[PDB]
Symmetry: C3
Subunit: 158 residues, 3 copies
Amino acid sequence: ILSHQSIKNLLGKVILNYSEENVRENGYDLRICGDKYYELVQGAELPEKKATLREIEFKERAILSANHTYLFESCEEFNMPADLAVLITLKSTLARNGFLAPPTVIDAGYKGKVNVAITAVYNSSLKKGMATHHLIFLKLDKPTERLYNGKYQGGILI
Amino acid sequence: ILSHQSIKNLLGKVILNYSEENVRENGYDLRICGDKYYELVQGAELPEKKATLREIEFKERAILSANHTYLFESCEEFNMPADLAVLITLKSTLARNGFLAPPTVIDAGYKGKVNVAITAVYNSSLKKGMATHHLIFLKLDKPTERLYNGKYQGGILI
Amino acid sequence: ILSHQSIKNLLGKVILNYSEENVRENGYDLRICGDKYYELVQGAELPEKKATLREIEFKERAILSANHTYLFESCEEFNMPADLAVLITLKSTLARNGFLAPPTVIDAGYKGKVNVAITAVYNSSLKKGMATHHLIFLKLDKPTERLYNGKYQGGILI
Ligand SMILES: O=c1ccn([C@H]2C[C@H](O)[C@@H](COP(=O)(O)OP(=O)(O)O)O2)c(=O)[nH]1
Ligand SMILES: O=c1ccn([C@H]2C[C@H](O)[C@@H](COP(=O)(O)OP(=O)(O)O)O2)c(=O)[nH]1
Ligand SMILES: O=c1ccn([C@H]2C[C@H](O)[C@@H](COP(=O)(O)OP(=O)(O)O)O2)c(=O)[nH]1
Ligand SMILES: [Mg+2]
Ligand SMILES: [Mg+2]
Ligand SMILES: [Mg+2]
């Protein structure tokens, strides 16, 4: 895992549209932004049918309904090198305040902002621009021979 | 963390019943399979009373109801060495499509397929054999003096 | 990540109010304890308004209602060094029995017990003193120049 100082050196290179204060003890606090956020309104039938989304204008705050999953675009944009990966964890502030998120990863070679899924256990809200996730940077044992080039490259929503 | 090439070398040794294409940038995509899958129908009273399960024939697709947790057996079988551990994360495809899963770990010394719990936020479905989780391989600072030999050894469901 | 033997050495130094038996293959099993546990009863409006909590006496067992998040104080107290961090994962026993928890982290420099959020998918219960989470210890590439000193220092609930 990369320390605070090691992450600080990633600013402006691996982590774009960053905030200096968001570099913590041993991770980076990802913020939610974007012109819109999405509410899943109908279940998915994977892999052929994706969940149905409701597009919502992201003004100042995102209003969430209990038992619904929401997709948010990160403020930060990534340009992952061939020797780094990131484990996306949830900030304990969101965890202890009734929000759920599964652990997911940003792969080496990935480029673009990320889209994170937050599920609300209660009717609640999150302020646009606030920090929601805690990124843990993992170093690969060797530069990967397979960089990311999947369907989400560039920050594709879903 | 192990890279793509390092994981590829684990095929047929640490990862059995594998798919070469499922070795990604810095992890392996676990698939759900098995003759049956399970729906938790009654809550648990831990540790004395486990949740009550409903056994379902796993034909072609698993039908999930909102607000229910389901147990799936992995296609892959594991034979973990004393110097490796695995962090089970959820594929972002499942995350952004309304599925929840908590982070869990496969310990050094563990042998057998794993049983993963996926919770559906919406009425939905998953296709038998599809990739649902992203495995991150962690190296222990030193070979562990305590290999796994717990109650789930061999791939015990619950 | 740290092996069983390496974790065992942290006992009485980094991990206080511990249990020898809880040092596993490659992690430590955190226990829930404390005089009280909390039920989130009203959603949060982050960051200005935290969720509303209901304080419950923690006698022998915590009774959980489906679709509710609960905050539990850990038995263990931490004194994190400048070169270590901890990934909090959920024990698979809780995962396969209908409990959800997001991945969260204990930062280098953090002092005190931790407060973990468990969400019940079903009406259920957890016994006081039982192991619920699996702690994975991560070593920082370098001693962090920024130790924890946030609002939760000392084990602040929320
Ligand atoms: O919560 C997340 C996690 C990761 N990603 C990005 C970065 C990662 O490199 C890419 C992975 O896309 P994929 O491998 O093609 O699909 P999956 O994550 O399901 O394996 O998606 C996100 O946008 N949000
Ligand atoms: O989602 C998971 C995670 C891990 N395991 C297996 C591998 C791991 O080594 C073992 C651990 O079982 P345990 O230590 O006996 O109980 P717990 O995971 O609750 O600590 O269970 C699973 O089958 N499913
Ligand atoms: O489930 C958790 C995770 C961590 N912590 C503690 C240890 C960690 O070092 C501190 C971090 O608090 P913060 O950085 O101030 O807020 P956040 O976790 O939301 O970024 O909280 C807990 O009590 N419970
Ligand atoms: Mg994980
Ligand atoms: Mg996790
Ligand atoms: Mg986790």
